[PDB]
Write a protein that binds this ligand. Sequence first.
Ligand SMILES: [Mg+2]
Ligand SMILES: [Mg+2]
Lengths: 335, 319
Amino acid sequence: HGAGCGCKISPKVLETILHSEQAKFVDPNLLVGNETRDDAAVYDLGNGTSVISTTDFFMPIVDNPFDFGRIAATNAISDIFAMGGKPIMAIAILGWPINKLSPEIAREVTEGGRYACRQAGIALAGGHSIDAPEPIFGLAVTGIVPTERVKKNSTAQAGCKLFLTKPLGIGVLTTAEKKSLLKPEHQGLATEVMCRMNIAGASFANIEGVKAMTDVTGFGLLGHLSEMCQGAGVQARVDYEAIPKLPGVEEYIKLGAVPGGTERNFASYGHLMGEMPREVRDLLCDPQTSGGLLLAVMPEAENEVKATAAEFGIELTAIGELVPARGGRAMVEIR
Amino acid sequence: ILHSEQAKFVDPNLLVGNETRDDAAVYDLGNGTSVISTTDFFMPIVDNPFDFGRIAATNAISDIFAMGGKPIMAIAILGWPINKLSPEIAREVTEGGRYACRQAGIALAGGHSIDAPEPIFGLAVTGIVPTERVKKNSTAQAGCKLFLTKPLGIGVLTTAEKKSLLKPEHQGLATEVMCRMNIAGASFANIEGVKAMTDVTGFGLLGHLSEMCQGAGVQARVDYEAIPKLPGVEEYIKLGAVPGGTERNFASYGHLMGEMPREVRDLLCDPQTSGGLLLAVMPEAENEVKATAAEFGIELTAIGELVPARGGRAMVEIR
Ligand SMILES: [Mg+2]
Ligand SMILES: [Mg+2]
């Protein structure tokens, strides 16, 4: 009943570079997981177990309060799964304009959060809330991961196949909802895609063959895959059609619903990409709120993994491969 | 105000603190170690950006100490009117936060930020405690003596400075008091006889005390004289200097308290942003608690006691 209060959901609002640069520097340690550019902190307990701490929150992406809460919680929890961790708890983060919106609605948002948490196997353990001019919801999530998984960090490798657990286009569908979103299966499909919890990541990390694992969110596929190629000093080749896509995204893109986030993404990652046709570019730069997992996996597993994806029923999309860096070739090139 | 969690239904363990209200969530790994998570965030409570950062952070970490935990991580919560206030102001607040974090022996590790019409800053903080050493706010028992680790009167000083009623001798005291870290909590956790512990923040001493009593099914008797107060907080309360949050507090729990005069009421219900630890301690451990507190430069005398419930919830040996 109101993604109407946000307002302006892109892209100077969520994690504005400017602000994002405030991680700073340091090395007193036990803290192995975020001192620099990272989106999560990780602390080694020394017994072979590390605690993960991660936070994310935003303004309403959808009009339905329950769904908004589910999605935001799902997105916040994804960060633990994408490092191959297990969430053990979560606490709510809520700003709400009480002089404007009733506490009933706010409760709906929170119940959404609680639902998404239950899907992750945890409880929403309370939280903190304040009066704010614009609604803000998210979580601070805590997790555990074996210390070996973080301390030995692949580093994907040349020869790796590239896999995607969710189709792309979330940004464009939500943008198409601004107006021109059509009634057909373009109703609620983006919500359903966002609310798929990345729970299988925790299992994917128990495999050696998979060299790199990240979640594709907000930097878009271009940004996340480019980041995966930056470490490992390797380039990427992607089949642009193998690429799982939401129903009717290209129609919405060529008809013009592209969030400003994609532009911000192109300004950041565009030089790493070949010169590309506008619609394709808008697809690759599309921020994915609560997107899926990008996997860099090699053959000795092409199936072991695959199995697993099947066990969680996600299975699964091959979009391309990783090649050793060669000259004159783009870091990520599209075919 | 909020109440927005719980709920209808539920999921369970090994969540130890939750969900009624304790200061922080705690989860039991079966290895003798529990993990604590808490978050807190605010709109600016002072002019100085750096000190605002310092204070919001101190307040957020306080809840780990109230559980008797040791802080390990902190992550920033920030929202900022990028078209209104400068990013350099933001870095100053953040720097306040990093400094406070360092005072708790931890790094401020990244965070999340958004554009928000009004400035908001706080932390999500993570801590650890041996499982059997957790100190909930609800586990007190009759016979306990009460202790308080910071003197009262923060709100009255903040509003006296806001109303230009602050005497020159008192400049910046409230800020220094606020920025004192509740680190002693992590040591009180080692005392078997410390039955319960919480922090006094903004709900007022009487509010948090009421939470202890409700939680434990007991009642309290407090001695107004014995309660540590900030210099000229009494005098500043007379012709206050009595912030609007105070009457919100007395509206909330006032029906649970005995008769007390205007000024007394106003001091005891006064919001303390980032205030002291409030402890319930069995007589056998009193000594240890006082000596442990002494290590951290805190001199302690009982402010009252916990008795079996009969009459009104908290009574003041008023004055
Ligand atoms: Mg992520
Ligand atoms: Mg507290």
